[model samples]
Target: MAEQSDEAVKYYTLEEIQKHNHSKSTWLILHHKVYDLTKFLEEHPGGEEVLREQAGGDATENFEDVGHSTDAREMSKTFIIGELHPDDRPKLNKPPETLITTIDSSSS
Candidate 1:
């Protein structure tokens, strides 16, 4: 019931995500997933300043540090608009430059 087409996910660059930092529409990245927290701000526990403080940027560290409960974690998924573009990730590797071709179809 939860599956989608092969490439069902959407991707966003840091530039696109940051534009929504204003109260008009706040978005932030958590664990690589982009969440639009605009509407959820008022409902957030602990005064909502924490969310505002890092709006439109990766908030994974502060979020985890809060040690949010399972319920909070589960609830967050409802806001996932998409993922951070793979190319924007700092640790991602590969451009597939080498391996002197052959388009090998068998490595098993």
Candidate 2:
């Protein structure tokens, strides 16, 4: 079997997310929001240590006054392991036929 990357460890199972609810570092995914820090932890200016501590858990209380910005918005969408936002996530009727496609082309 192939080995998984360290990034894989960052993603907790659905059960683990539910089980470790007491830790300030741990978080939950509810109502389309990741109540955890797996996504934004590394980027914290405080240091990566804070993120390491937040491992295997939700870290909401810590973000009370932390605030957010444009970069965080762009980076967060990638960490989602499951259907964190089923309703809002983009969808298509079928996959595209080619790797690249022209936009607003008059010719088909």
User: Against the hidden reference, what TM-scores do the models get?
Assistant: 0.69, 0.36
Off by over 4 Å in 2: 1-14, 18-46, 83-108
Q: Tens digits of per-residue lDDT for model 2 on 1-108?
A: 146644332333545555534334545553334455544455557744655444434444454456466775677575554433323232343336653566657764
Q: After superposition, how far is residue 64 of candidate 2 from its true place, in Å?
A: 3.1
Model 1 / residue 42 / CA error / Å: 0.9
CA lDDT, candidate 2, residue 33: 49
- lDDT measured at residue 77 in model 1 versus the true structure, 0 to 100: 75
The best candidate by TM-score is 1
Task: Report lDDT per candidate.
Answer: 0.75, 0.48
Off by over 4 Å in 1: 1-7, 89-91, 94-108
